[PDB]
Amino acid sequence: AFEALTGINGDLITRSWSASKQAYLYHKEEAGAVVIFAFQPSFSEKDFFDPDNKSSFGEIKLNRVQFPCMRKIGKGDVATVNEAFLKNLEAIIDPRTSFQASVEMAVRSRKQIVFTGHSSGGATAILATVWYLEKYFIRNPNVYLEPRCVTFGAPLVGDSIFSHALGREKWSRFFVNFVSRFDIVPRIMLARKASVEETLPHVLAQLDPRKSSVQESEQRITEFYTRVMRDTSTVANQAVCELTGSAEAFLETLSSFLELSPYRPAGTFVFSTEKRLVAVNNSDAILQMLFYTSQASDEQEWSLIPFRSIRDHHSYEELVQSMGKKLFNHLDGENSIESTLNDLGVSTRGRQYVQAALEEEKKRVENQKKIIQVIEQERFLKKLAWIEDEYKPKCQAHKNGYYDSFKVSNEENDFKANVKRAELAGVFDEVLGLMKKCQLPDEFEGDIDWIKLATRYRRLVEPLDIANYHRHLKNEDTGPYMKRGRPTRYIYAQRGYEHYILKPGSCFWAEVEELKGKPYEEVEVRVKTLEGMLGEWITDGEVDDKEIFLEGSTFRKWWITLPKNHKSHSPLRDYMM
Amino acid sequence: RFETSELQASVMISTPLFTDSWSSCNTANCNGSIKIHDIAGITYVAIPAVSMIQLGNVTGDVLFPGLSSDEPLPMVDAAILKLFLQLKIKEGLELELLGKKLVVITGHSTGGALAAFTALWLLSQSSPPSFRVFCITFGSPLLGNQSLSTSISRSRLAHNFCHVVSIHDLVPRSSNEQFWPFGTYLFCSDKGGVCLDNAGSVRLMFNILNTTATQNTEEHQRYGHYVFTLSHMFLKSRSFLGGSIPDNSYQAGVALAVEALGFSNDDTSGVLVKECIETATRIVRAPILRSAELANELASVLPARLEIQWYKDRCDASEEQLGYYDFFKRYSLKRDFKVNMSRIRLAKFWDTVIKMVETNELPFDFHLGKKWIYASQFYQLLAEPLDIANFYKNRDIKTGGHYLEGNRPKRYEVIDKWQKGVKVPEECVRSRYASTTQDTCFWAKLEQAKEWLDEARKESSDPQRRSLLREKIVPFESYANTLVTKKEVSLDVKAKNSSYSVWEANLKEFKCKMGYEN
Amino acid sequence: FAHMEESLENLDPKIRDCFLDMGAFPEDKKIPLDLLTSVWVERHDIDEETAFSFVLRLADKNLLTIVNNPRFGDVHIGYYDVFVTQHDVLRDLALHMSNRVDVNRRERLLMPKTEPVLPREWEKNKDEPFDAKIVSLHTGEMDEMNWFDMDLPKAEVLILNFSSDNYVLPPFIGKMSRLRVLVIINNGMSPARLHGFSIFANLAKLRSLWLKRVHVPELTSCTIPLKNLHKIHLIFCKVKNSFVQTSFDISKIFPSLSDLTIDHCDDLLELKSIFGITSLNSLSITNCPRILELPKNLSNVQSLERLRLYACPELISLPVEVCELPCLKYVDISQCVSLVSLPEKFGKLGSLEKIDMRECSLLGLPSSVAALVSLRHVICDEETSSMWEMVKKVVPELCIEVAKKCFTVDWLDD
Numbered sequence A: 001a002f003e004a005l006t007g008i009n010g011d012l013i014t015r016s017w018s019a020s021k022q023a024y025l026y027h028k029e030e031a032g033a034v035v036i037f038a039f040q041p042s043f044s045e046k047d048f049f050d051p052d053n054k055s056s057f058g059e060i061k062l063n064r065v066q067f068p069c070m071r072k073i074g075k076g077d078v079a080t081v082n083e084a085f086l087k088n089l090e091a092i093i094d095p096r097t098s099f100q101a102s103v104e105m106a107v108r109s110r111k112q113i114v115f116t117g118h119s120s121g122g123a124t125a126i127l128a129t130v131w132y133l134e135k136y137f138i139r140n141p142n143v144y145l146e147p148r149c150v151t152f153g154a155p156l157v158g159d160s161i162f163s164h165a166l167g168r169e170k171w172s173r174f175f176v177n178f179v180s181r182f183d184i185v186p187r188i189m190l191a192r193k194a195s196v197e198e199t200l201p202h203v204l205a206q207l208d209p210r211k212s213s214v215q216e217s218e219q220r221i222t223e224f225y226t227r228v229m230r231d232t233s234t235v236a237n238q239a240v241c242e243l244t245g246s247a248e249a250f251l252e253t254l255s256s257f258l259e260l261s262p263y264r265p266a267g268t269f270v271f272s273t274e275k276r277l278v279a280v281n282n283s284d285a286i287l288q289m290l291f292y293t294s295q296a297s298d299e300q301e302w303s304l305i306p307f308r309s310i311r312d313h314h315s316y317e318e319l320v321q322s323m324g325k326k327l328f329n330h331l332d333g334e335n336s337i338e339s340t341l342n343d344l345g346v347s348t349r350g351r352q353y354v355q356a357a358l359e360e361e362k363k364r365v366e367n368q369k370k371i372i373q374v375i376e377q378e379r380f381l382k383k384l385a386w387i388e389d390e391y392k393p394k395c396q397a398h399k400n401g402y403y404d405s406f407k408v409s410n411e412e413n414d415f416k417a418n419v420k421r422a423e424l425a426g427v428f429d430e431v432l433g434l435m436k437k438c439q440l441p442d443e444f445e446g447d448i449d450w451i452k453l454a455t456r457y458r459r460l461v462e463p464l465d466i467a468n469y470h471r472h473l474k475n476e477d478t479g480p481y482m483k484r485g486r487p488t489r490y491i492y493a494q495r496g497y498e499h500y501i502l503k504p505g506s507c508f509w510a511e512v513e514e515l516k517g518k519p520y521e522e523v524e525v526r527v528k529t530l531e532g533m534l535g536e537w538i539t540d541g542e543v544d545d546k547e548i549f550l551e552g553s554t555f556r557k558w559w560i561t562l563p564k565n566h567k568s569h570s571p572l573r574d575y576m577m
Numbered sequence B: 001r002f003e004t005s006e007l008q009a010s011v012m013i014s015t016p017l018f019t020d021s022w023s024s025c026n027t028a029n030c031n032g033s034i035k036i037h038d039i040a041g042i043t044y045v046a047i048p049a050v051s052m053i054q055l056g057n058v059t060g061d062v063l064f065p066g067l068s069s070d071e072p073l074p075m076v077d078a079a080i081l082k083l084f085l086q087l088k089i090k091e092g093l094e095l096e097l098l099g100k101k102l103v104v105i106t107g108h109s110t111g112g113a114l115a116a117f118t119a120l121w122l123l124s125q126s127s128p129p130s131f132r133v134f135c136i137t138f139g140s141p142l143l144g145n146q147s148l149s150t151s152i153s154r155s156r157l158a159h160n161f162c163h164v165v166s167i168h169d170l171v172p173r174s175s176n177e178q179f180w181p182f183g184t185y186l187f188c189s190d191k192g193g194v195c196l197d198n199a200g201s202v203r204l205m206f207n208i209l210n211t212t213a214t215q216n217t218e219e220h221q222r223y224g225h226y227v228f229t230l231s232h233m234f235l236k237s238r239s240f241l242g243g244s245i246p247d248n249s250y251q252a253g254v255a256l257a258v259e260a261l262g263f264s265n266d267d268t269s270g271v272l273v274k275e276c277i278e279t280a281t282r283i284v285r286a287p288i289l290r291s292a293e294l295a296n297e298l299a300s301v302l303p304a305r306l307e308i309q310w311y312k313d314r315c316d317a318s319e320e321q322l323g324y325y326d327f328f329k330r331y332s333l334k335r336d337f338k339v340n341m342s343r344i345r346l347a348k349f350w351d352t353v354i355k356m357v358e359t360n361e362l363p364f365d366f367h368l369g370k371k372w373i374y375a376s377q378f379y380q381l382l383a384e385p386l387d388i389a390n391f392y393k394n395r396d397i398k399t400g401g402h403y404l405e406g407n408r409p410k411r412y413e414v415i416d417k418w419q420k421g422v423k424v425p426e427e428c429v430r431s432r433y434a435s436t437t438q439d440t441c442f443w444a445k446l447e448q449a450k451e452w453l454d455e456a457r458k459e460s461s462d463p464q465r466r467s468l469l470r471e472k473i474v475p476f477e478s479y480a481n482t483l484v485t486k487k488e489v490s491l492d493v494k495a496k497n498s499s500y501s502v503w504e505a506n507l508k509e510f511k512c513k514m515g516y517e518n
Numbered sequence C: 001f002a003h004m005e006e007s008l009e010n011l012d013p014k015i016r017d018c019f020l021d022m023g024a025f026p027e028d029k030k031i032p033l034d035l036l037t038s039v040w041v042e043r044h045d046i047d048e049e050t051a052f053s054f055v056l057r058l059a060d061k062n063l064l065t066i067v068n069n070p071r072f073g074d075v076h077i078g079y080y081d082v083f084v085t086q087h088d089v090l091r092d093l094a095l096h097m098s099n100r101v102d103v104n105r106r107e108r109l110l111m112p113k114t115e116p117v118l119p120r121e122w123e124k125n126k127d128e129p130f131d132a133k134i135v136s137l138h139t140g141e142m143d144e145m146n147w148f149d150m151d152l153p154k155a156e157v158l159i160l161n162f163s164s165d166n167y168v169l170p171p172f173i174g175k176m177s178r179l180r181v182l183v184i185i186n187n188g189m190s191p192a193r194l195h196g197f198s199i200f201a202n203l204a205k206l207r208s209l210w211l212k213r214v215h216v217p218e219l220t221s222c223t224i225p226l227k228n229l230h231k232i233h234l235i236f237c238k239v240k241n242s243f244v245q246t247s248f249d250i251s252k253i254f255p256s257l258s259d260l261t262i263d264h265c266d267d268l269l270e271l272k273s274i275f276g277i278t279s280l281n282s283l284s285i286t287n288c289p290r291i292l293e294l295p296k297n298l299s300n301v302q303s304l305e306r307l308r309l310y311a312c313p314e315l316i317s318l319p320v321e322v323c324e325l326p327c328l329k330y331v332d333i334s335q336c337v338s339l340v341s342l343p344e345k346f347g348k349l350g351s352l353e354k355i356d357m358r359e360c361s362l363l364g365l366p367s368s369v370a371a372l373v374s375l376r377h378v379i380c381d382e383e384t385s386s387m388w389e390m391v392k393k394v395v396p397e398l399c400i401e402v403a404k405k406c407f408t409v410d411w412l413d414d
Ligand SMILES: Nc1ncnc2c1ncn2[C@@H]1O[C@H](COP(=O)(O)O)[C@@H](O)[C@H]1O[C@@H]1O[C@H](COP(=O)(O)O)[C@@H](O)[C@H]1O
Pocket: A429, A464, A465, A466, A468, A469, A474, A477, A478, A484, A485, A486, A487, A488, A489, B369, B370, B371, B374, B375, B378
């Protein structure tokens, strides 16, 4: 069921491998409707670790402009990619290369897009498919322009944020990477640059298939293998302990005292072994399997695993030829996995670790379903109803803005609205705290229902919160609303709404109160900007003009205090009345 | 859902510092003197071990505000402190700490004890060191005390102490019960190592090792072989079948740990080790999920604080202008009864939250949650004056303890620490009077000043005695005037019938009557 | 006004007189329903059921304006928020009748404003006590003794309104040959003092007692045995001196106070003397934040029919002697913060028929409570519904009534 799971046929794998070798000599492969693009691999010391970068782990913050919608929606932080691979991407993107022109021509004819490569030639291909995904898939999602990316033994290139963003966009299914059981090409990047700088050029020269690849100094190969293995073991142990582990202050202390690679596996790695084939989707379990599979078994195996990996760097031909002739097992769908991992050679500790990762994924989806069920309960909808149908309409009838009524009033209504706002804020802060610690699926922000509910909650409740905040004179105790005191639930809802509307707020009372007092020329410019923002808000619906344009509104009083010249200049005169 | 002790041990072993500290200690042992050097960006303070030692066993010379003299003084050995004084390493590290950010103190046996004591002195200071301090001492004696261990525990510095002990090492095992362990102790073996953070678990492991017949006199070579094989263990894996592998994750992990430390799974002592490993990890609900339930409970309690605020506003709006503190002191309306209900509910909720914070069912950074700090601050500003008003109402005349001298809930202390954790307040001039009094003990100090003034008017007729009393009241009234000028007190303090106004009038009359003005 | 007279005529004397005497209560102050039925029984000898029927008869008329009826939960539930409001014109109609002045009788007496200036009857001792069965004295700070002699040859009902502080007991009680009703109310903002309590102690035929915001006199043997008294209600009265009087057993002096009522009172350090009585039938300690433990020596009160609690946060939980009363039929426990794991243990409390808990922190109940076969009328709160269902499974007579809490600002005003 490998073809059913990945959507890639074995003949396409054969074509990908053939094009990969051919491109060794951006090679296009017009094979029917499928257009196979193969990038030429390179074996140089600067290729894996960019000299410009100073950190022990070559990384650079991905520019939001070139890579929109890869940053985490929460916390507003971008992921990290290898600097040299990004330089290769930008070099290929150049119009003189005409690679992007060829891709555009192929897409205009609705031809299938396939990106392939081996080692370096592959790592880049993955970047280029991500680039094409953000170029065309996100704007108009469609089946015909859906690309495919198959690569053999590529070094890890994405961070944890990159994997989270890939999963959130549901683009991880288009990625399938073939990795041999013994191959140091994908495992090298999980190591400190200085720890391997001594023997890196030698092993890179030996690994070059185009090169003679002979006269290999076992000593140097063994040292490089030992350093890479040690670093990968440290990274994997730290990751598994962080994900599910006790003594968190202990890990925090050594994390303050240590430096570990942040790059994490991304996509759907498929492992290869003479006995059977195995494919996994869990990113954390991918690193665990990567470390455990390449572990030594006996003294006869030792000093041969380095040599075995060196030869298996170019042994993917036999795997492609015998891909159909090997049993396929989907690790995620498989219930009993002990026998499969024993065939893979993974020790008991690795089996338990990957099982714990699968269980933690099950717990994450269970928490998602529990939150969904809690949201579906009628009581929360009733509580929203109360606010939108008893408090606000009564305030409209009382000729007082519900915000202004919230400020000064004695009616129980106000107390009931306060209680409802507190109850809603508690649940929304619960959900926000669950989302902060990544205890909810990466796609929990994705579905339109939750973001719509959060936007409605913000637009309905946030004026009440600011009314409470300014009424108690906390602005003169800590500061303005925007500087401090803004709950991050509303900020997260605004971020989600902005991200949703990027492809195809309601806190104006804050700055309105800020403008109160100390009138100046800069203030009146802010008044004009406010007026424009209020117009575009009532166009959007974040704030409602009629409940704000009342005679008893605080905005109305502030405008009355405003000099008559800005009043004459403003266009909202007729609307205010 | 897994016995992470083995995972933590593997993480600590895979760290380059595990080998770097051993190399530094060996180099120091060869040198025989204090070794200061920088390897891989980390500096190691390598104190050579002293052969002769007698660890038989407030401090004018030693500066350790972490000893917790309030609790039974920790019995620190005479030898360790006398060595720390006599090697004069203080001047050395002060001239070596300049411009350093990360340091890993290293030691062995008595050298390890020296390193541990030096680090403990480093963190136990009024200001924490800028450079991060870690301890990698191995073979150090078990010297210490229960009071010292618990002081490090509440100081949250136990994690900074990491120690590796062999299964055949007797130097730490051969110690009195008065020496209580602290920090993280790891029982490394030939097959593998296990980390034990709980002091009781470490004590039980020490006891079972004492009952075990371990005979290895030359512990230094054992330590060298152990660090070598542990550094080179990650290269070669094993079956790790553990005989009959249990289906349960907990039992399988415990059996793996027992096999890693050398003891057989079916061994009687191996079975005891299995039981103690099972009891090592506490089985409670995940702290992250409990944080959300605490958030929901805070949301549920919030309307009670809304109603107490409404009561305070109504009392302020009252025509009597007596003051909500005085209104609560003179409870004659059912409003006072129900507001006492609300305040007792808030007190119960916050006491539960603080107690659970102390017991560690919550993330360690719960205090750094920002929102919780602000909620605690609001609660303290809206509740504590009423609590002290109730206490004073129930306070007999003979009860002179007041609120400053004891009789203060510990929840308020913890809240005060949490507000100590906030940013520097902006010194913006308040346009109007503050909604709530910034000082949470102002009313109690006002009551004490009222008692002092009453004593002055019914005693100390002696002009000088009265003069000293006047000297006592004048700084407090100056403080109150400054608070008024900055508008850090609500309208209740400025109320015509408020206790503060009556006290000020009595002060003015007394000043006129003695003629103490100017 | 004419329609008021017509309605009074429509009501037969059994109810007409009851109303007329009910209109003699302070117009501004509210009237407790229990006090109203008490005076109605002690005056017109109507049974309690007849008094309730007459209350309904007035209720259908617009003259009566009841505050509320949350006691509807069960008949066992005592009078709750049942204060009634009347019209001043209705009291003016009683004045327009001038029954006392017209007949020169000491019955149907009323003086508005509670002015210190006593009436022309007190003046020159013109108080012709032809018949004094009905007595409503409204006073402020004037001498309670008045300025005349009130022998009260036939006075079964008497009330007294007052204010200020340091009041004295009028000698009219001692002069009174017989009397069954005594009501004193202090409208001041501070507890009121009373002097010369022996005047009220002269008579031994009193049957009802009701005081509010007054320092209660000590419960020594100076008071003549009141073998006809059956009701005692205390409101906003510090009983520090009068209580802890277990030296004088209340039952041993007199069978008085068969039912006891305490509300909004503090300083109740102990309760041994309260449980030392043997003639007690109902107890209700409410709005008392000064109770920590109900004494285990409650076996003396074995005829206790109902025990009701409304506000006591310091009380840790119910004792184990709760399930030792074969007469306990109604129990109320609400608004008690410290009630975690309420030890009802209602295995031997089968007499309990109705259980109400508007709001509670109950966290656990013994299986014995499920054994209770008479756990009907369960007015439970929103929480603890699973446990009511568990009891429902074993005993389907639960008759559960989930309580939805409401929030108002009416508590903010007085
Ligand atoms: N000076 C202050 N005092 C008390 N709490 C503060 C505060 N400043 C900020 N906060 C609260 O602290 C929380 C911090 O944000 P977050 O929950 O996302 O970590 C916000 O919910 C914020 O709520 C803001 O405070 C207002 C009152 O909070 P409560 O209703 O909980 O008393 C809210 O209306 C909202 O604007």
